[PDB]
């Protein structure tokens, strides 16, 4: 499939938490205005990752989903502390195209199947945060803090068996840096699954996206490099097309 460029919007209390250099926007912290902007400059999909306190998280994420869905016409995923079927179902019914589950999927893998059978596998993204531990890629839950003891090579296979539609694969080893995506990890996972793999963590330069796609990623996710205009979406897509990557150009 043609590769996708995905913008990640970290949100809390209904607002974007990261700064941007988009001076043409009224309120860069409004996730709806910023998501609509990204959808108009060539981003293929959005991911919203919420870190609101649990007491207000449910209503905050539902309010976000409905306001985003009514203004944007590209697919979006919502995630961050989705712990059960009822929560995932409510977010999809409110307008989210896809939900991302991570900790809850590890602790109850059948949850993947329950959501996929109700709403289709396309509605289910399993986010996998992985790190090298003692010579093996290991799966971490709770925002990258808990070593589950589950090997990445086993979990990727299980996630597909359970009905996930996509894997959002973050390298804890590269996340927050601009050194490059973890192409070793992406290549390692690639033959273990037929599912789309979204590369996440490490983006710094246009060549990094090319390398991630040559490693087998189906999509590449980034945040601050887009927000700060360290990478321009149109320039990136033109660069990828010139180097032989099949990208979506319906800007």
Author numbering: 2 to 252
From the paper:
We have studied this problem on the example of the mobile active site β1α1-loop (loop1) of the (βα)8-barrel enzyme HisF, which is the cyclase subunit of imidazole glycerol phosphate synthase. Prokaryotic ImGPS enzymes (including the ImGPS from T. maritima) form heterodimeric bienzyme complexes that consist of the cyclase HisF and the glutaminase HisH subunit, which supplies ammonia by glutamine hydrolysis. The active site of HisF is located at the C-terminal face of the central β-barrel, where two conserved aspartate residues, D11 and D130, catalyze the cyclase reaction. Based on the conformation of the loop that connects strand β1 with helix α1 (loop1), these structures can be separated into an open conformation, where loop1 is flipped toward the outer α-helical barrel ring, a detached conformation, where loop1 is not visible in the electron density and presumably flexible and a closed conformation, where loop1 closes over the active site.
To assess whether the mutations have an influence on the conformation of loop1 we determined the structures of the HisF-G20P and HisF-F23A variants by X-ray crystallography. In summary, our crystallography, proteolysis, NMR, and simulation data demonstrate that the HisF-G20P and HisF-F23A variants have opposing effects on the conformation of loop1. However, whereas loop1 primarily samples the open conformation in the HisF-G20P variant, the loop1 population shifts toward the highly flexible detached conformation in the HisF-F23A variant. Whereas the G20P and F23A substitutions decrease the kcat of wt-HisF by several orders of magnitude, the F38A substitution has no effect on the steady-state catalytic parameters. Instead, the G20P and F23A substitutions likely influence turnover via alterations in the closed conformation of loop1. In contrast, in the case of loop1 variants HisF-F23A and HisF-G20P, kobs, increased linearly with increasing concentrations of PrFAR, which is indicative of a simple binding process without involvement of conformational changes. The HisF-G20P and HisF-F23A variants on the other hand interact with the substrate via a one step binding mechanism as loop1 is, in those cases, unable to close properly over the substrate.
